Amino acid sequence: RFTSNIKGLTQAARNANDGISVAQTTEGALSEINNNLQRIRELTVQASTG
Amino acid sequence: SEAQSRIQDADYATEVSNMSKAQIIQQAGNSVLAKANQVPQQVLSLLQG
């Protein structure tokens, strides 16, 4: 039983690491999308002048 | 690259420990094998010849 448990926890730890990696990838994508949106807001503030 | 490295690239810290364990088991097994092979001749000691 202890062997089964330790193997299961090891595999679970690897799965959690994989999830952390996918979350990191998503966060990077969202960060650069944020940069693009900030630049668009920059342009919009520029364009309001008559 | 970070994600793929998390699956590949075996952790050396555990690898060295497993290697040392395997070496110790190998040495102990060989020694006990020799000691077991040193047992039978007690029958010759019994036979007194």
Torsion of CA B6, B9, B12, B13, to 10 degrees: 10
Token pair belonging to A34 = 């944020």
* Distance of alpha carbon B9 from the chain centroid: 25
Backbone phi, psi, residue B38, to 5°: -80, 0
Query: Which of B15, B16, B13, B4 has the alpha carbon at shortest distance from A17?
Result: B4
- How many Cα neighbours within 13 Å face the side chain of A37? 6
Which residues have CB under 8 Å from A14's CB, separation 6+?
B6, B7
A25 — contact with chain B (CB < 8 Å)? Answer: yes
Which method, experimentally, gave rise to this model? cryo-EM
Distance between CA atoms of residues B12 and B20, nearest Å:
12
> In this complex, do A18 and B6 lie within 8 Å of one another by their Cβ atoms?
yes
> In this complex, do A18 and B2 lie within 8 Å of one another by their Cβ atoms?
no
Distance between CA atoms of residues A32 and A25, nearest Å:
11
Distance between CA atoms of residues B6 and A19, nearest Å:
11
A17 — contact with chain B (CB < 8 Å)? Answer: yes
CA distances from A38 to A17, A33, B47 (A): 31, 9, 97
> In this complex, do A22 and B7 lie within 8 Å of one another by their Cβ atoms?
no
Query: Which of A25, A9, A33, A13 has the alpha carbon at shortest distance from B2?
Result: A25
Resolution of this structure in Å: 4.2
Query: Which candidate in A21, A24, A25 is best for mutational testing of the B interface (most B CBs within 10 A)?
Result: A21
